[PDB]
Amino acid sequence: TRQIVLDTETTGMNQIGAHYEGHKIIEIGAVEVVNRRLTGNNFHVYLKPDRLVDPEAFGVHGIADEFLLDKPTFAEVADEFMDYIRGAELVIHNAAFDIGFMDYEFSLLKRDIPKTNTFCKVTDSLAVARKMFPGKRNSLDALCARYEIDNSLHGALLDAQILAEVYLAMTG
């Protein structure tokens, strides 16, 4: 088997209701792990949304609308993206967020693509962290502080690499 530690950046999210509705993925970052080792077979893409980035979202990832204009759309990278993760165990911090966004984008392609959970094992590192450290703060930053990992703007690929180190530490 193989594990893909993944993260995404978006145009934002809804405080109420379906968190992804009307928003878009603008960055996908993922790093492969096999036998607890970073293989180097990574995936990274920026995507052109059909809308503006919420200022708040920009506050988190620093990905500008100007930067996304010449980038491919989700439809254009869809298959290359699926080929890459298919069959692997996806490790995502608060998996519900990204999986919801991923399935949302796939559904927009109108290709009857099945739910990500049907062709990938989905592991929620936030759930793993909560079982491991109940009653504690388990955000990615808190976990980094816990494991004394130094990381002196967020990014999908960056957040994936960081989550990979954190997850390895958590499961070591």
Partner: protein, 75 residues
């Protein structure tokens, strides 16, 4: 063919990051978010500052195709 950025040249990937910073400055100027452009250029690898300045000019032009911070879109 392949869009995967991770599969590209280190130089190419380095360029993408400078682009991210450059476009970021233009973005802030458009949304009226304080930013000191000169400080950011400094933060970039010396052998790429020339690239940063050109990309900054480039992205500032693209900014004109987008709404200003004072426009309805951001109301």
């Amino acid at each position: 063919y392949d869009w995967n950025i991770a599969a590209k040249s280190q130089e190419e990937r380095d360029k993408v990051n400078v682009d991210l910073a450059a476009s970021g400055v233009a973005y802030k100027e458009r949304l009226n978010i304080p930013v000191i452009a000169e400080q950011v250029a400094r933060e970039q690898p010396e052998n790429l500052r020339t690239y940063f300045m050109e990309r900054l000019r480039h992205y500032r032009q693209l900014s004109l195709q987008l709404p200003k911070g004072s426009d309805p879109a951001y109301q």
